[PDB]
Write a protein that binds this ligand. Structure first.
Ligand code: RAL
Ligand code: RAL
Lengths: 229, 217
């Protein structure tokens, strides 16, 4: 199924799978982390629904689906954020009613360095004029890639399938860039520039997790392990 | 001004700049590993000066990039020379360690397993030497970037051009070329991850000044 999709059909499925932009509740420095936490927790629900619609993801065992989301969920939140913030220089659009600047990040101990890395990524996307079709491909790469090196004959089968699906998303990115008129050299170069940004998003996720710990497996299984009823 | 080399000249320069394999100074694991890494750093600086385009950056930026990249560079080198040693990491020719030795150091075995998994990934893609040296140069120029930045990106673009060249020269289709390029660059996010976890581990147990002093030999 997923391996038979054309590039156009991959783009469409990913665009359709997109989760909604959530809001914060209808503010002060003291309630800031509570609001961000509440937002991230509501976004996780929609993240599971989205991941189940990424072609190939539901072909995996539930254990492997849990592993991939457990590895990727914060990178996925962050790339969503930097995407939402791209048109808001110097600000992070956590939600439409929760647009924060650097100074508001100061107030939470540990956060401004991460806030600064997020802002620079959003500036980098803005410089590259990142398109929504490219965004959804990158977010799907993160889902399938971040946990794939921390996993039997079934496991061997699973990893091959993941890499085949990753290869299809690469084909899709290149097709988008060719459709946009880029020369072949420019296509390869832009693919590389986008994927190297994924290393920076990994970096920010690890710094973020350290920060979050200074202040999940079963929960993901519960949401992922639905009945058929 | 390194933007003028051809792909073959870029490969040849990278291959010729490769550092030597050092031995473990002995004749206490973490002390040995610490001693080795500190001696390898010197040779890493000499290597970096030969990466085309690097020296065209200010010293401040040269230092900044090395400070951000050095553990990732040590790790990918470790993974590369451990390929032919399944289940073991060849820290040095006289310092070949397996998991249970890694387990002896509280907080190491998880990253030890990640390193082992990376070397198995390299062995299973049949990573080539010309590819490896391109990947290390990318780590150097990319890890700390987030006119000077323009230049860094413009060298990074030159390395992507070179990778595609090597793959085309191997007979890969255009589709296979961009597929493998992507697989290689996604491995760099796992190398970043292992460096992040390694730094947390090492620190649970300034550098710029030391790097400056190394650039004076
Ligand atoms: O503030 C958060 C955040 C807060 C709490 C989180 O975890 C809450 C615990 N919960 C456990 C179950 C899984 C979901 C998270 C995660 C992110 C967000 C981010 C962050 C930024 C800097 C930093 O140092 C740390 C985090 S990035 C982000 C993007 C969002 O869409 C929502 C919240 C956020
Ligand atoms: O064990 C080390 C190691 C030990 C000490 C180090 O740093 C010592 C501090 N030193 C201060 C001056 C700057 C250079 C670092 C670095 C790596 C190596 C590694 C490691 C693996 C797992 C893990 O959890 C932590 C580290 S990987 C590696 C590759 C090498 O070529 C050499 C040492 C190593």
């Amino acid at each position: 199924l997923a391996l038979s999709l054309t590039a156009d059909q991959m783009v469409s499925a990913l665009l359709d799978a997109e989760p909604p932009i959530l809001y914060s509740e209808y503010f002060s420095e003291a309630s800031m982390m509570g609001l961000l936490t509440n937002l991230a927790d509501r976004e996780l629900v929609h993240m599971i629904n989205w991941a189940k619609r990424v072609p190939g993801f539901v072909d995996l065992t539930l254990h492997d689906q849990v592993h991939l989301l457990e590895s990727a969920w914060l990178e996925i939140l962050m790339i969503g954020l930097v995407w939402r913030s791209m048109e808001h220089p110097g600000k992070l659009l956590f939600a439409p009613n929760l647009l924060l600047d650097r100074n508001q990040g100061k107030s939470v101990e540990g956060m401004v360095e991460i806030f600064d890395m997020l802002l620079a990524t959003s500036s980098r996307f803005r410089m590259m004029n990142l398109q929504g079709e490219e965004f959804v491909c990158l977010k799907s790469i993160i889902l399938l890639n971040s946990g794939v090196y921390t996993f039997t004959l079934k496991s061997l089968e699973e990893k091959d399938h993941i890499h085949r699906v990753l290869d299809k998303i690469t084909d899709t990115l290149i097709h988008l860039m060719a459709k946009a008129g880029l020369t072949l050299q420019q296509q390869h170069q832009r693919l590389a520039q986008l994927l190297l940004i994924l290393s920076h998003i990994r970096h920010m996720s690890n710094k973020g997790m350290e920060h979050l710990y200074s202040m999940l497996s079963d929960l993901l299984l519960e949401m992922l392990d639905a009945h058929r009823l």
